[PDB]
């Protein structure tokens, strides 16, 4: 949805 949300929705950390 709209160029990704970059790389699995930001990233879990």
């Amino acid at each position: 949805e709209l160029l990704e949300l970059d790389k699995w929705a930001s990233l879990w950390n």
Side-chain angles (χ1 to χ4, degrees):
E1 192 175 88
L2 186 62
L3 73 170
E4 290 184 277
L5 215 67
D6 286 274
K7 286 131 188 181
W8 101 85
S10 181
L11 41 282
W12 52 66
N13 61 89

